[PDB]
Paper text:
CDT is composed of two separated subunits, CDTa and CDTb, working in conjunction to exhibit the toxic effect. CDTb is the cell-binding protein that assembles into pore-forming heptamers. Upon CDTb pore formation within the host endosomal membrane, the catalytically active CDTa cargo is transported into the cytoplasm. Here, 2.5-Å and 2.6-Å resolution X-ray crystal structures of the antibodies BINTOXB/22 and BINTOXB/9, respectively, in complex with CDTb—the CDT subunit that forms a heptameric pore for the delivery of toxic CDTa enzyme into the host cytosol—showed that both antibodies sterically clash with adjacent protomers in the assembled heptamer.
Unlike BINTOXB/9, BINTOXB/22 does not interact with the D4 fragment by biolayer interferometry (BLI), despite binding to proCDTb. Therefore, we produced a construct with D4 of CDTb removed, termed proCDTbΔD4, to facilitate crystallization. Crystals of BINTOXB/22 Fab in complex with proCDTbΔD4 were obtained in space group P212121 which diffracted X-rays to 2.5 Å resolution. After model building and refinement, the structure revealed that BINTOXB/22 binds proCDTb D3 and D3′, a region that does not directly contact adjacent protomers in the context of the cleaved, assembled CDTb oligomer. BINTOXB/22 contacts CDTb D3 and D3′ using an interface almost entirely composed of the antibody heavy chain. Specifically, CDTb Glu662 forms hydrogen bonds between its sidechain carboxyl group and the sidechains of CDRH2 Trp50 and CDRH3 Arg95 of BINTOXB/22. The CDRH2 additionally contacts CDTb by forming a hydrogen bond between Thr54 and the CDTb Ser661 mainchain as well as hydrogen bonds between the Tyr53 sidechain hydroxyl and the Tyr669 and Glu740 sidechains. The only contact formed by the BINTOXB/22 light chain with CDTb is a hydrogen bond formed by the mainchain carbonyl oxygen of CDRL3 Tyr92 with the sidechain hydroxyl group of CDTb Thr631. BINTOXB/22 does not bind the oligomerization interface of D2, but its binding to D3 and D3′ nonetheless results in a steric clash with the adjacent protomer. Critically, trypsinization in the presence of BINTOXB/9 Fab almost entirely prevented formation of the CDTb oligomer, and trypsinization in the presence of BINTOXB/22 Fab completely prevented oligomerization.
Author numbering:
A (entry chain B): 1 to 202, 205 to 214
B (entry chain C): 52 to 746
C (entry chain A): 1 to 52, 52A, 53 to 82, 82A, 82B, 82C, 83 to 100, 100A, ...
Write the structure that this text describes.
């Protein structure tokens, strides 16, 4: 099966900048390469077919190049409506592999998150559950690491994480981390902490059940 | 339906019709936006106008008809006085033909035209005559004593010397002779002489016989057709006066059931049933031999048996080589009995109301029965492009027909062996009785009394037959064609290309015809003719510099079949092949059209049997050229056999064709290989299905 | 022009069967095949196979041989994708895509999401996320509401009936233990809470439920 290896999972850019995505075919596909754009919740849209042929109605800022195994897709000037995932695809022979995709993102300065931690509400405890929620708001870049610690011990199980899309105003990201326990297990620990770690910053928010 | 028909003449004497257009009401104004798209305001000067139609009042009374212009002359029923003011006693629902005439030099252009206004007064109440009371003339009612475009008018004296002059509308079909001979168009009931710029805007150029009110020989006049005033269930391509309204009812089989018991209502006995596919054209293409080379521009093929879409072939599916008789144990001299699932169709342009078809069920020449379906059991009416049962529903079982409600169709032991040998059941519809639709009163379609019988024969005597076969749908047409030997035959001359365009409503892209998204130029399809048509085309091709079959004149009696390919590539926008052609270089403008495959070495396609039908004969066609060398192109096809042929291309493009056959679904891939040498160019590679083969 | 229109979103229990349709228009249906593509929540676009609209024969990718069935209704210009004995891994968006010119996927359907869950329609529980006291980053306090245990999507979350729009982060829902959970944070000036009321408004149309949760300080 002909495999399509794409350049970068994520690419940071500015509106009006030039970006190029490369794609390496695992074997000769001649010119039978397509480039697809996919905006969240929408279907992929064919932008470039046969390596270099612009598809009908596609703006001329989108260009395609290459033959054989090395292929380039270029946005000469990135528009805000171009912030999406771009896939290369060989349409030479089945299984018509798609690249893993390249997400376009707005470049901005690094930003530490505003971390907030919330103990289980008394309502949820009355229902027998216990969720501890950590909000990591307005940080950059997207790859933030969230760690839960109970009484100094890292807690892997029961953690749900959820990232927002890039904020269209300040280009930051926000994420939510929920640690769900049973009420019985929750009332048998004292200290609950969530830690937000970036490259050079680490922020720990805590609460002790003994201190409410 | 409503309004009056305006006749706008450039001259003062109602002779040179510049524009025919309907008006809405007594204001006598047409739709100016649509007329604007068809008229040049610098060439729109008119000096006399006539409006004709019918007044139908909604209340009995003494109506005074008048016009704001004292210049205007009116008449009602060709019986009243001719005056600018008329007093008519009218009755509700009764029809009063009206003819309003205005003669005026310095009337101006059509745009600047302040047309007169038509009023009527009942009980002293004067108002513009509303649209609801104004109706166009019945243009299907050709009245010799009330011609649609009369040669005389209310204003000029009938001069003695003016005798022996030409009629404006010799056949009284409401299209002037100058229009018919030189070309016209009708859109939204607006008629005008043809201009070549109208083609860019999408208007269709109509020509018809100025001596024949019904050029196609069908129930509808040249004007009924061109204007679209006929039954709306008729296909829109039959609006062209040279494309006949012509129902073509056939039937195909999609399940064959053979039992040892003759009774339809009996659950005892051995029975074997198999699904079947069917073809409306296989009997035509199965008699086609394929040559590798084509000469003198004749890039088409000849069939020995031009069968129409009414002759339907049946292919038994999923048989696995198991004889029909193993599941029946019928012995020599005994008979099994046939039941089938069938589906009627109409590949024509017109509906068959009260469809009463007669179909022979044929096996190796033997008529096993003659199916006489009754209209009440097959949907009463069968519209063009539709089927009974309708496309989404289960097929009709023969045993539910009155004819076979008690007994089925017997089949011999020896005929069962023919079925095992691969002989196909033909459903040959030999005649279909039925009616056509004429409008009546409020626009309602009336059918009884309107027998198709005489029109079917009349149409066939002056026409050519053109069949377009796609995988999904087949289309058969009758295009009026001239007898080139008849010096008095005033049928308009069409090239085969112009006829194909009209017959199927084909569009154009870079001068080449398209049927929806399918290319149907002669270089993208398999054209199939019978022997007589092919000889005429070969002789015509020798008289042309631009040797294209589509430029050859159409002659009556010609039999033409356009088989669109299953897979095709022009190495441009179109390539619906299910696999990739290897080593394809289309960075050139050296194609038959657009780009070619500049073949430097070997180009190969591997096609799995999942992408081809089993036990079919296919033809692989294409065009090749080599401008500076005569290098042989090696063509290799691996299907049921592996065959190799050496092809010599010329400086210009020539066609090549190779037939190959598929076998079982489990067969290996079909592999087609072409080997060139640097300056070999390939274009328009097609794979076309031809016929089923024994299993 | 050419349009591929798929059937609506699907909610199915594990072990059930689902049939997705794909109606084609604007082109000769039988002249081009139909690809089927799967896109799992976090995975890349995967080709499931194609259906030849000429032969009616399906071709399946190796990972989709068994429970998957392509079928055809040429008279309706419709392709079908049926998945039998559904598993959680079958949860994805499914696209039909024309096997177009040069085998490019030149026209795509809008997609059909398939949610596999043992749950049936369940309204959410809405839990307040209050800090209580001693919490103000740059003169700002962050409140939230936790929307837990609902099915299916979607729930909409607003704050003070829309009056709080800026400073709101509603986070995408995550399906855990066959039910959905989401959270929403609002950041308001410390001068406005708890002095002025802050209320999470949760709407769950599938259960015809609206929940308004006022956020009050924790007891301590
Ligand atoms: Ca005439
Ligand atoms: Ca005529
Ligand atoms: Ca070409
Ligand atoms: Na007027």
């Amino acid at each position: 099966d002909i495999v399509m290896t794409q350049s970068h999972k994520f690419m940071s850019t500015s509106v009006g900048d030039r970006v190029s995505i490369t794609c390496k075919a695992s074997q000769d596909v001649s010119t039978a390469v397509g480039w697809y754009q996919q905006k969240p919740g929408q279907s992929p849209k064919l932008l470039i077919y046969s390596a270099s042929y612009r598809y009908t109605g596609v703006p001329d800022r989108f260009t395609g190049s290459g033959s054989g195994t090395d292929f380039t897709f270029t946005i000469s000037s990135v528009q805000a409506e171009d912030l999406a995932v771009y896939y290369c695809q060989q349409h030479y022979s089945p299984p018509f592999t798609f690249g893993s995709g390249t997400e376009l993102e707005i470049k901005r300065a690094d930003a530490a998150p505003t971390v907030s931690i919330f103990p289980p509400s008394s309502e949820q405890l009355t229902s027998g559950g216990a969720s501890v929620v950590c909000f990591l708001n307005n940080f950059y870049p997207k790859d933030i690491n969230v760690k839960w610690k109970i009484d100094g011990s890292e807690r892997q199980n029961g953690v749900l994480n959820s990232w927002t899309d890039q904020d269209s105003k300040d280009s930051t990201y926000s994420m939510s981390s929920t640690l769900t326990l049973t009420k019985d297990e929750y009332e048998r620990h004292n200290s609950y902490t969530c830690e937000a770690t970036q490259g050079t910053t680490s922020i720990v928010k805590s609460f002790n059940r003994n201190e409410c | 339906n409503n309004g009056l028909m305006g006749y706008y003449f450039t001259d003062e004497h109602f002779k040179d019709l510049k524009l025919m257009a309907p008006i809405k009401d007594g204001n006598l104004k047409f739709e100016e936006k649509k007329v604007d798209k068809l008229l040049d305001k610098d060439k729109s000067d008119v000096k006399s106008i006539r409006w004709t139609g019918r007044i139908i009042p909604s209340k009995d009374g003494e109506y005074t008809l008048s016009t704001d212009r004292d210049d205007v002359l009116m008449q009602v029923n060709t019986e009243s006085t001719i005056s600018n003011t008329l007093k008519v006693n009218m009755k509700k629902g009764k029809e009063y033909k009206v003819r309003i005439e205005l003669q005026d030099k310095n009337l101006g252009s059509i745009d600047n035209l302040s047309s007169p206004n038509l009023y009527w007064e009942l009980d002293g109440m004067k108002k513009i005559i509303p649209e609801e009371n104004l109706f166009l003339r019945d243009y299907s009612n050709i009245e010799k004593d009330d011609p649609f475009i009369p040669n005389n008018n209310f204003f000029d004296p009938k001069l003695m010397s003016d005798w022996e002059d030409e009629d404006l509308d010799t056949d009284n079909d409401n299209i002037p002779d100058s229009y018919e001979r030189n070309g016209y168009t009708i859109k939204d009931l607006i008629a005008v002489k043809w201009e070549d710029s109208f083609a860019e805007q999408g208007y269709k150029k109509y020509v018809s016989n100025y001596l024949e009110s019904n050029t196609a020989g069908d129930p509808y006049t040249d004007y009924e057709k061109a204007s679209g005033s006929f039954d709306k269930a008729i296909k829109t391509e039959a609006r062209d006066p040279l494309v006949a309204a012509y129902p073509i009812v056939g039937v195909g089989m999609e399940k064959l059931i053979i039992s040892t018991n003759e009774h339809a209502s009996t659950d005892q006995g051995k029975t074997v049933s198999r699904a079947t596919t069917n073809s409306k054209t296989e009997s035509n293409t199965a008699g086609v031999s394929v040559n590798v080379g084509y000469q003198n521009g004749f890039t088409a093929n000849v069939t020995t048996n031009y069968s129409h879409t009414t002759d339907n072939s049946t292919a038994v599916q999923d048989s696995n080589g198991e004889s029909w008789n193993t599941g029946l144990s019928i012995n020599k001299g005994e008979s099994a009995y046939i039941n089938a699932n069938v589906r009627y169709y109409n590949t024509g342009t017109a509906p068959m109301y009260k469809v009463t078809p007669t179909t022979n069920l044929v096996l190796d020449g033997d008529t096993l029965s003659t199916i006489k379906a009754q209209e009440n059991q097959i949907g009463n009416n069968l519209s063009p492009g539709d089927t009974y049962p309708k496309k989404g529903l289960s097929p009709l079982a023969l045993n539910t027909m009155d004819q076979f409600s008690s007994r089925l169709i017997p089949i011999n032991y020896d005929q069962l062996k023919k079925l095992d040998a691969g002989k196909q059941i033909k459903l040959e519809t030999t005649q279909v009785s039925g009616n056509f639709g004429t409008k009546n009163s409020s626009g309602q379609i009336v059918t009884e009394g309107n027998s198709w019988s005489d029109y079917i024969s009349q149409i066939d005597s002056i026409s050519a037959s053109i069949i377009l076969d796609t995988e999904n749908e087949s289309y058969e047409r009758r295009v009026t064609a001239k007898n080139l030997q008849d010096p008095e035959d005033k049928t308009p001359e069409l090239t085969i290309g112009e006829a194909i365009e009209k017959a199927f409503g084909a569009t154009k892209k870079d001068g080449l015809l398209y049927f929806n998204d399918i290319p149907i130029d002669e270089s993208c399809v398999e054209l199939i003719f019978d022997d007589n048509t092919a000889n005429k085309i070969k002789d015509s091709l020798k008289t042309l510099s631009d040797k294209k079959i589509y430029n050859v004149k159409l002659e009556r009696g010609m039999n033409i079949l356009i088989k669109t390919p299953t897979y095709f590539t022009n190495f441009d926008d179109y390539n619906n092949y299910p696999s990739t052609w290897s080593n394809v270089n289309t960075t050139n403008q050296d194609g038959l059209q657009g780009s070619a495959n500049k073949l430097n070495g070997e180009t190969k396609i591997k096609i799995p049997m999942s992408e081809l039908k089993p036990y079919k004969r296919y033809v692989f066609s294409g065009y090749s050229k080599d401008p500076l060398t005569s290098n042989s192109i090696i063509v290799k096809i691996k299907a049921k056999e592996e065959k190799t042929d050496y092809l010599v291309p010329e400086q210009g493009y020539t066609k090549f064709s190779y037939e190959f056959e598929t076998t079982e679904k489990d067969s290996s891939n079909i592999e087609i290989t072409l080997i060139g040498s640097g300056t070999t160019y390939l274009d328009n590679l097609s794979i076309t299905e031809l016929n089923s083969t024994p299993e | 022009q050419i349009q591929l229109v798929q059937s609506g979103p699907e909610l199915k229990k594990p072990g059930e069967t689902v049939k997705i349709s794909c109606k084609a228009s604007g082109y000769t249906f039988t002249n081009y095949g139909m690809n089927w593509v799967k896109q799992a929540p976090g995975k890349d676009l995967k080709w499931m196979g194609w259906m030849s609209t000429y032969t009616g024969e399906p071709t399946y990718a190796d990972d989709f041989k068994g429970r998957f069935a392509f079928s055809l209704e040429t008279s309706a210009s419709t392709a079908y994708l049926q998945i039998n004995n559904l598993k959680n891994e079958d949860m994805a968006t499914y696209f039909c895509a024309r096997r177009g010119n040069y085998l490019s996927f030149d026209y795509w359907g809008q997609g059909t999401t398939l949610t596999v869950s043992s749950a049936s329609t369940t309204p959410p529980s809405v839990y307040p996320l209050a800090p209580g006291s001693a919490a103000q980053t740059n003169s700002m306090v962050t409140l939230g509401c936790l929307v837990k245990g609902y099915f299916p999507e979607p729930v909409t979350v607003t704050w003070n009936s829309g009056s709080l729009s800026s400073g709101v982060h509603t986070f995408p829902a995550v399906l855990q233990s066959d039910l959905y959970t989401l959270s929403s944070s609002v950041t308001v000036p410390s001068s406005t809470w708890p002095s002025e009321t802050v209320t999470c408004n949760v709407a769950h149309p599938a259960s015809s439920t609206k929940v308004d949760k006022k956020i009050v300080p924790r007891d301590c």
